[PDB]
Design a protein around this ligand. Structure first.
Ligand SMILES: CCCCCCCCCCCCCCCCCC(=O)OC[C@H](COP(=O)([O-])OCC(O)COP(=O)([O-])OC[C@@H](COC(=O)CCCCCCCCCCCCCCCCC)OC(=O)CCCCCCCCCCCCCCCCC)OC(=O)CCCCCCCCCCCCCCCCC
Ligand SMILES: CCCCCCCCCCCCCCCCCC(=O)OC[C@H](COP(=O)([O-])OCC(O)COP(=O)([O-])OC[C@@H](COC(=O)CCCCCCCCCCCCCCCCC)OC(=O)CCCCCCCCCCCCCCCCC)OC(=O)CCCCCCCCCCCCCCCCC
Ligand SMILES: CCCCCCCCCCCCCCCCCC(=O)OC[C@H](COP(=O)(O)OCCN)OC(=O)CCCCCCCCCCCCCCCCC
Ligand SMILES: CCCCCCCCCCCCCCCCCC(=O)OC[C@H](COP(=O)(O)OCCN)OC(=O)CCCCCCCCCCCCCCCCC
Ligand SMILES: CCCCCCCCCCCCCC(=O)SCCNC(=O)CCNC(=O)[C@@H](O)C(C)(C)COP(=O)(O)O
Lengths: 276, 170, 13, 178, 111, 106, 65, 88, 57, 118, 77, 157, 126
């Protein structure tokens, strides 16, 4: 379970760095955090996994609701290449999207701090697979990186949408549930984690580089993704590489598996069972 | 309560006293009092009306008891009448035995839920009871097949008794 | 408002 | 969409198709608008400096090499418009594109709920009823005895007459019916 | 011991109420998205009640509502394990679903 | 190349009939021919609470008390936490307190 | 509720959306600052992780040699 | 609420707006019936770029064969109206 | 091994505005941020250790 | 950590493994060693219904924290002192475990020195 | 109806499109879609959005509320 | 209906006139029609259409069967029900199939090998085991009260 | 740096070499194919736009496809050594393999119960 969760969170973070559809990016974010929960269950910490279940539910609900408001305002436009300047054109949605991104990355004392940081502390300070540990830390850093990718390509830079502005987010049926989910994503982790009965006792005696590990890798992930986005802004074309092709095409797992297993299965069916 | 603790045992409840160190009111107590005064009183009034209507129209039903027909061990081969009698008696005992196992399993589940974390220590005597009743059920009814019968059960018991007698020789 | 007729199947039956 | 494809694409058509596809993948790579405009002007300069080739075998060879380079340098996940095939909202409203012949099968109560629209509807059906015979006669006139035949259709060549096979084109369901 | 079970079953009954309303042939007269959103928010409040109770006394409950079937020595009964995970995920899921239902009423208009 | 006169004339006539068909898709002002508000807190949310919440409360609570507690092992709860210094309501005894706690450095 | 569309200019921003967005952002930052002031266990903990090398051989109790 | 309906005059105004913002076309000589190579003197790459600009404005792709069929702003306006069902 | 100098001779004479220490791509920018993050962090850690030597307990 | 690279790269004979701890007699090098004393006993463990994982040598502080929370269930931010006491007890237990680990590591080094001296 | 702005306001001066135009004129090339593209760099969109400006939105009022809350806690205790 | 045996599929064509008749029946050209090899597999005179899925068909064209992307009267592939758009895809990929296969296999092998490396080289903390009182909780874990276990002694340090 | 097509990832129709080395025979072939497609399209459009039609349009291609897939296979089947071997393997090999798997497992289980080594914890309802 530990190895499987570490593998899937690493793979889905890899896909989410170069996905372009925003729903695809946050779906791979969902799969990465689900992998982190599987890691937490690989350790003997099921209650931390359930705490992150609740935390991740709040985060992804508000993140997809904000993305849906962006899509509905931009007339069913779904990828980040035809967005931009959201911080100025849609301030409420941009503010809540930034809140969700920071809370998902693990900005301290939000809902994500009381589950994700304890998960990183447990994996750093308990006996596990070393490679699973390293790729879990890398997956957390990449979580920061694709959250920064969403923030950059949606809420920053210049507008890239079609000119006709049909932006109207003033509907209370839009504004109120995002507000409730924002109140959740700010305070619910604190309230829940201070109301949990003490189970699955933690260790807190640890070095500083094993304590602030999650915050440090989140900060460096934000910085690396910011510099990558600035280089993409910079006027220069680079030749594509197999790493980016692998990450963009979902590791070739859908193409290979979804083309070879239905083909041999249905070909075996028709050409052997029925006919022969 | 139509059930009784000789067949469905239950330890007496030991709840602690409320000792509120804080000064804040308890919304649980407030909502419990409001829920009682709003919900429990009309429900218990309707139930009292229903029960006095039942007392006005009260009837009785009985639990059927079957006398013991002669067993299949004294049953002659090929005489289908007392074969049928012993077979239906064995079927009735089989169904009663199934319900006996159901009561024991329900008791074990109740012990586990009541003890919670301490189920590895306080459920020991009914875990031993469950192990004994499971072993006896496996001795009398296991591996009979879909067409289980009194004759098949007797053949299995005779084979097991012969095995135990041969093991008791040495 | 400029409402337009929408085409639907026979839901009466 | 509204024009039927020919037997073959000419060399100019292939070059323009490659130009449009290359510029679409170029904007997919560039994302930012000034970068896209710079690189698009560079690609336009490349096409212009290979424009005036007179051999046409060298032009076909250059087209082959250009499309090999395009397949090597294309975006793995290009930008697709939502209403275009492969898009997010492609064929989204086909579950609402209900064909017009169910109005023939509605009950008189639902028909009575919309009286004047249905009166216009039998007006359209009767217009179709004379125009169908007229257009079958016209299409029988227009067919060449032998040789090449394309999917293009003639228009009405006299007054008071309608273009042949107009019903499925005119009375198609709306793109956003609801 | 009665308020807890009554609250859990009221959560389930409040969830099943809009389905019966939907098949009850009065959707054409009432506002079904608003009615269902109110139903989910009330389910959230009556789900908060056992959340506070479990935060106080940490009692874990097992409720055997309906006996479905008995097959020899195996008794299939409709039972609910109202646990820490069950209560907390019920409250979180109901709050999230209330938000999603209001967002759906905004989003999937002209449908 | 551009539209042939064969096809440009057809699309002009086909689109002209397309405007007329879409014009006829409009509705008359009489279409379709179909054959105590108070405030939200006092009527809209109060009638919902006494009908969709209070009425199902009574039917559920009747089943919970008079059709679940009557069966033996239906509602089973874990034992409550008993700490030193607590008083048992049912029994009336007091559990003795803990030891002297030698470590009190923090 | 509805507002007039714009062709190529900046859209007209209502006051409600900007005030509520600023309020939510300010509330999040106030919560972070308040918790960082009160319980700053996000950095270093509060336990001062010991150095095993500075421990003495007498309290570790190995035989001397 | 959202997604206001399109008009024929709005489509014509927007198409003429983008063709006026194009540099190779002088806005005084530009008309709704101005042919792209006959009396505007452009070429096929410019035609492709014009169709791409209309596509990027209106947010949907014109397929390729209709794209080389379209050659004046009146035809482009008629195609947009036929595609988005703008009857007035 | 293959002569890849002329293709790398095209990726550096581009007058794209980046200085000579950054034209190679995202690896160089990452590495330059990395050598900023440990030199300045090291210098700040150096002056703390010198101050701790300066002031005893 | 530095112990991992020293075990996997420098030497594994003198640097221990986490499984067989301790690998030495407890009285070796200690003239007298007192048994570890515990406050709570099994009756209050069972009455407090502690998880068998958390029935360690800080169970008395855990029972104090749980009693504080159950008493002041409203205003749940009222057992910070008891939580700190329990966490510092767990920190002391962790430091005790590190002390045992370092003691048996130095005992392995002493065994290596004895084998070299022989 | 909806009225369009006057296309003549869409200029090139002070824009990354001017930077692109200079870079293209260094190679003897002219970009004809620049005025069509120019609306995204003028008016309300004419501003450089920075990552600190995105993250620290509302930080001034959050800090003010934090200082007010600290003063309230000091006055109450 | 009105479909007779001269329009239904028949036996494998041998003579060129039979091949021309089969091509005219399937509404193909004589040069384009090419039946399956005569291996006795029940194919008959049914043509070998190229093994390309319906995804590669032109999506901007108004096919008569728009879900199937096919016109009316054209020959239907023998594997239509597996080459439909809900099913197996044969469209060209931006990167070659063997490259994708070797990249997937190399990624999986790299992950498995490094997981084995991390298993043989575990990462932990410089601590001992967790100390548990009362003979490692002998009675709590379900030990026999009548039997007396071997005492497990933990010492202060 | 060359695209390698597969049966599951075919060669692009404009990256194939046959489209650039085109011949007048090929051009006449595509002209004839367009002619056949246009005749079929005209026939289907007439049948589709006929208002007197009161039924669905039958598809002879679909009828031929179903007849070839269902009722023609056994008339056109001839026994060869290859398909005889294929049928024998596909009809007996899985049966023999699963027979040996189940027989080995059941014999091992029976041996374990008859020697008493296999215990049944609470298996009472088998
Ligand atoms: C423990 C839990 C156990 C159960 C767990 C189940 C898990 C799996 C759930 C799968 C759900 C599948 C699904 O999506 O079904 C959609 C399907 C209909 O969805 P739809 O797409 O809107 O279809 C409507 C049409 O498209 C368009 O029609 P419309 O829009 O006009 O809809 C009007 C509405 C109008 O509905 C009606 O008119 C209701 C018809 C039945 C009336 C019965 C009156 C009895 C009076 C007694 C006195 O029609 C319907 O809702 C469908 C009609 C048929 C429904 C039949 C349901 C079973 C009836 C059994 C009757 C038994 C009588 C015994 C005597 O709904 C159902 O099948 C029923 C609801 C789901 C199951 C029950 C609720 C959950 C379990 C509760 C216990
Ligand atoms: C000893 C000295 C001679 C050695 C020798 O020549 O061995 C070759 C000889 C086979 O002859 P061959 O050289 O393949 O002949 C090909 C012709 O020269 C050239 O082919 P052709 O076109 O001239 O022949 C037409 C067709 C002539 O038409 C046929 O062969 C008609 C089909 C005959 C039966 C095919 C059975 C296999 C397919 C079963 C499919 C699954 C069914 C459901 C399950 O021949 C074949 O299809 C060739 C295969 C013939 C197999 C004959 C097997 C006879 C023994 C069968 C025992 C019972 C089988 C299971 C029955 C189960 C009943 C419930 O024997 C072996 O290879 C050893 C196996 C012998 C049987 C065991
Ligand atoms: C470190 C350890 C690592 C361990 C790694 C272990 C890996 C295990 C992998 C297990 C799963 C393998 C098989 C998965 C098959 C998935 C097939 C599928 O659903 O493909 C979808 C595909 C169409 O979807 P696609 O084209 O991708 O996307 C739509 C874009 N137009 O195609 C379709 O939709 C076709 C429609 C269905 C056709 C019939 C399919 C029948 C399949 C029967 C399978 C029976 C055997 C299953 C064995 C499972 C074993 C676990
Ligand atoms: C949908 C799934 C519903 C499952 C629960 C069904 C409840 C109704 C039922 O079956 O009641 C049976 C009960 C008689 O059964 P019993 O008590 O065993 O009989 C002994 C005396 N002859 O008969 C009665 O109690 C009759 C009186 C019923 C009064 C109203 C009961 C309302 C129950 C509300 C909770 C139901 C379950 C909620 C959760 C559903 C989740 C899907
Ligand atoms: C992203 C990666 C994209 C890579 C694309 C690489 C393409 C760049 C290389 C080229 O442009 S080579 C173009 C070769 N084309 C020709 O030689 C066609 C020349 N023949 C002609 O007849 C030309 O005059 C025209 C342009 C086709 C005629 O059109 P007019 O404008 O009507």
């Amino acid at each position: 379970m530990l190895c499987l969760g570490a593998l899937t969170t690493l793979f889905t973070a890899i896909c989410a760095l170069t996905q372009n559809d925003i729903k695809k990016i946050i779906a791979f974010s969902t799969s990465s955090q689900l992998g982190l929960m599987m890691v937490t269950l690989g350790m003997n910490q099921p209650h931390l996994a359930f705490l992150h279940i609740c935390t991740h539910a709040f985060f992804k609900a508000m993140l997809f609701m904000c993305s849906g408001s962006i899509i509905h305002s931009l007339a069913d436009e779904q990828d980040i290449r035809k967005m931009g300047n959201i911080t100025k054109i849609m301030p409420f949605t941009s503010s809540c999207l930034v809140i969700g991104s920071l809370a998902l990355t693990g900005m301290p004392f939000l809902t994500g701090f009381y589950s994700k940081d304890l998960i990183i502390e447990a994996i750093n300070t308990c006996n596990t697979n070393a490679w699973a540990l390293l790729i879990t830390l890398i997956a957390t850093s990449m979580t920061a990186m694709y959250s920064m990718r969403i923030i950059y390509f949606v809420t920053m830079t210049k507008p890239r949408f079609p000119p006709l502005i049909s932006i109207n987010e003033n509907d209370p049926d839009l504004m109120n549930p995002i507000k409730r989910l924002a109140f959740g994503s700010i305070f619910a982790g604190f309230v829940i984690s201070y109301n949990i009965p003490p189970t699955s006792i933690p260790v807190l005696t640890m070095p500083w580089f094993l304590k602030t590990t999650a915050l440090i890798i989140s900060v460096l992930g934000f910085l690396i993704a910011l510099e990558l986005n600035n280089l993409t802004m910079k006027l220069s074309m680079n030749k594509a590489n197999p790493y980016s092709s692998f990450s963009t095409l979902l590791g070739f797992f859908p193409s290979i598996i979804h083309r070879i297993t239905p083909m041999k299965s249905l070909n075996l069916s028709l050409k052997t069972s029925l006919t022969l | 309560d139509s059930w009784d603790k000789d067949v469905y045992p239950e330890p007496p409840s030991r709840t602690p006293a409320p000792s509120p160190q804080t000064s804040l009111p308890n919304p649980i107590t407030y909502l419990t009092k409001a829920y009682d005064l709003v919900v429990d009183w009309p429900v218990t009034l309707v139930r009292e009306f229903i029960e006095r209507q039942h007392a006005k129209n009260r009837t009785y039903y009985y639990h059927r008891q079957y006398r013991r027909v002669p067993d299949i061990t004294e049953c002659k081969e090929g005489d289908v009448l007392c074969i049928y009698e012993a077979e239906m008696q064995w079927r009735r005992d089989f169904k009663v035995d199934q319900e006996i196992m159901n009561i024991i399993q329900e008791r074990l589940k109740a012990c586990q839920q009541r003890e919670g974390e301490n189920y590895q220590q306080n459920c020991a005597k009914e875990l031993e009871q469950f192990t004994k009743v499971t072993k006896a059920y496996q001795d009398r009814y296991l591996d009979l097949g879909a067409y289980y019968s009194a004759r098949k059960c007797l053949a299995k018991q005779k084979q097991r008794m012969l095995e135990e007698r041969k093991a008791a020789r040495q | 408002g400029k409402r337009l007729f929408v085409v639907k199947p026979s839901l009466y039956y | 969409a509204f024009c039927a494809p020919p037997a073959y694409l000419t060399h100019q058509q292939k070059v323009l198709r490659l130009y449009k596809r290359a510029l679409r993948h170029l904007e997919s790579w560039c994302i930012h608008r000034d970068k896209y405009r710079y690189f698009a002007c560079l690609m336009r300069a490349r096409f212009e400096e290979h424009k005036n080739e007179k051999d046409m075998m060298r032009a076909t060879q250059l087209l082959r090499e250009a499309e090999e380079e395009f397949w090597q340098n294309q975006h793995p996940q290009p930008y697709i418009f939502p209403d275009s095939p492969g898009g997010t909202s492609f064929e989204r409203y086909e579950c609402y594109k209900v064909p017009e012949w169910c109005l023939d099968y509605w009950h008189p109560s639902e028909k009575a709920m919309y009286p004047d629209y249905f009166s216009k509807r039998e007006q359209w059906k009767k217009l179709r009823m004379e125009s169908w015979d007229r257009e079958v006669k016209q299409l029988q006139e227009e067919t060449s005895p032998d040789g090449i035949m394309t999917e293009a259709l003639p228009p009405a060549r006299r007054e008071g007459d309608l273009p042949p096979l107009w019903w499925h084109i005119v009375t198609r369901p709306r793109e956003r019916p609801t | 011991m009665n308020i807890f079970t009554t609250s859990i079953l009221l959560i389930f009954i409040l969830l099943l109420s809009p389905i019966l309303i939907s098949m009850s042939n009065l959707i054409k007269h009432i506002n079904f998205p608003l009615y269902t959103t109110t139903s989910i928010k009330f389910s959230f409040i009556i789900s908060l009640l056992p959340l506070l109770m479990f935060f106080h006394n940490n009692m874990e409950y097992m409720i055997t509502t309906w006996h479905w079937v008995t097959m020899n020595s195996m008794e299939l009964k409709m039972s609910f394990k109202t646990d820490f995970f069950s209560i907390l995920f019920t409250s979180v899921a109901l709050f999230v679903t209330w938000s999603i239902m209001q967002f759906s009423s905004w989003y999937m208009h002209s449908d | 190349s551009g539209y042939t006169p064969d096809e440009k004339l057809r699309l002009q006539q086909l689109r002209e009939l397309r405007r007329r068909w879409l014009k006829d898709q409009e509705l008359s002002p009489r279409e379709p021919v179909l054959p105590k508000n108070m405030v939200f807190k006092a009527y809209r949310s109060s009638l919902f609470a006494v009908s969709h919440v209070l009425i199902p409360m009574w039917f559920v609570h009747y089943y919970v008390k008079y059709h679940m507690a009557t069966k033996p092992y239906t509602i089973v709860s874990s034992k409550p936490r008993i700490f030193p210094g607590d008083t048992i309501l049912e029994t009336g005894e007091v559990i003795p307190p803990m030891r002297d706690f030698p470590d009190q450095h923090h | 509720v509805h507002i007039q569309p714009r062709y190529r200019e900046f859209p007209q921003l209502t006051r409600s959306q900007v005030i509520q967005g600023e309020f939510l952002s300010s509330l999040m930052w106030f919560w972070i600052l308040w918790r960082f002031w009160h319980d700053s266990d996000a950095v270093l903990g509060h336990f001062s992780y010991p150095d095993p090398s500075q421990w003495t051989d007498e309290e570790l109790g190995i035989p001397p040699d | 609420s959202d997604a206001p309906p399109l008009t024929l005059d709005g489509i014509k105004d927007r198409v003429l707006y983008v063709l006026k913002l194009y540099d190779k076309i002088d806005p005084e000589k530009l008309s709704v019936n101005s042919h792209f190579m006959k009396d505007l003197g452009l070429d096929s790459l410019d035609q492709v770029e014009i169709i791409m600009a209309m596509e990027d404005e209106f947010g949907f792709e014109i397929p390729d064969i209709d794209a080389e069929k379209l050659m004046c702003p009146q035809e482009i306006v008629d195609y947009i109206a036929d595609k988005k069902d703008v009857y007035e | 091994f293959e002569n890849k100098v002329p293709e790398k001779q095209k990726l550096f004479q581009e007058d794209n505005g980046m200085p000579v220490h950054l034209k190679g791509g995202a690896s160089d920018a990452l590495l330059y941020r990395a050598t900023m993050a440990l030199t300045l962090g090291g210098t700040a850690y150096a002056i703390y250790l010198l101050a701790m030597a300066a002031f005893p307990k | 950590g530095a112990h991992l690279t020293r075990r996997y790269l420098w030497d594994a004979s003198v640097e221990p493994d986490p499984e067989k701890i301790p690998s030495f007699p407890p009285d070796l090098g200690f003239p007298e060693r007192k048994e570890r004393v515990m406050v709570a006993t099994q009756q209050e463990m069972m009455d407090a219904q502690l998880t068998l994982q958390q029935r360690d040598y800080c169970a008395h502080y855990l029972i104090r924290l749980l009693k504080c929370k159950r008493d002041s269930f409203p205003n749940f931010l009222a057992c910070k002192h008891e939580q700190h006491d329990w966490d510092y007890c767990e920190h002391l237990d962790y430091v005790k475990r590190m002390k045992e680990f370092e003691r048996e590591r130095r005992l392995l080094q002493r065994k290596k020195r004895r084998a070299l001296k022989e | 109806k909806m009225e369009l702005p006057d296309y003549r306001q869409w200029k090139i001066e002070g824009t990354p499109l001017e930077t692109v135009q200079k870079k293209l004129a260094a190679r003897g090339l002219r970009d004809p879609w620049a005025r069509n593209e120019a609306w995204r760099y003028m008016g309300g969109f004419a501003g450089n959005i920075t990552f600190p400006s995105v993250i620290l939105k509302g930080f001034k009022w959050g800090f003010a509320a934090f200082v007010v809350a600290l003063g309230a806690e000091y006055f109450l205790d | 209906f009105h479909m007779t045996k001269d329009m239904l599929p028949g036996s494998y064509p041998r003579t060129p006139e039979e091949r021309a008749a089969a091509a005219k029946k399937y509404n193909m050209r004589v040069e384009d029609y090419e039946p399956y090899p005569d291996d006795g597999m029940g194919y008959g005179d049914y043509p070998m259409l190229p093994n390309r899925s319906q995804h590669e068909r032109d999506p901007w064209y108004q096919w008569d069967h728009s879900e199937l992307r096919m016109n009316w009267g054209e020959p239907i592939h023998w594997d239509l029900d597996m080459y439909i758009r809900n099913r197996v895809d044969t469209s060209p990929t931006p990167v070659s199939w063997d490259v994708m296969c070797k990249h997937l296999f190399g990624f999986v092998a790299f992950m498995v090998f490094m997981f084995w490396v991390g298993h043989v080289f575990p990462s932990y903390q410089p601590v001992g085991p967790k100390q548990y009182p009362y003979n490692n909780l002998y009675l709590e874990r379900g030990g026999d009260p009548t039997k007396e276990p071997e005492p497990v002694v933990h010492y202060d340090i | 740096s060359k695209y390698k097509p597969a049966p599951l990832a075919t060669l692009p129709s404009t990256l194939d070499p046959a489209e650039y080395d085109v011949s007048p025979e090929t051009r006449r072939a595509q002209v004839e194919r367009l002619s056949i497609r246009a005749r079929l399209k005209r026939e289907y459009l007439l049948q589709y736009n006929d208002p007197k039609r009161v039924s669905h349009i039958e598809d002879p291609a679909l009828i031929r496809w179903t007849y070839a897939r269902s009722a023609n296979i056994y008339p056109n089947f001839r026994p060869t050594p290859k398909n005889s071997l294929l049928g024998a393997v596909a009809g007996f090999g899985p049966l023999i393999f699963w027979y040996y798997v189940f027989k080995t497992d059941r014999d091992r289980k029976e041996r374990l119960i008859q020697e008493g080594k296999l215990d049944r914890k609470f298996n009472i309802s088998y």
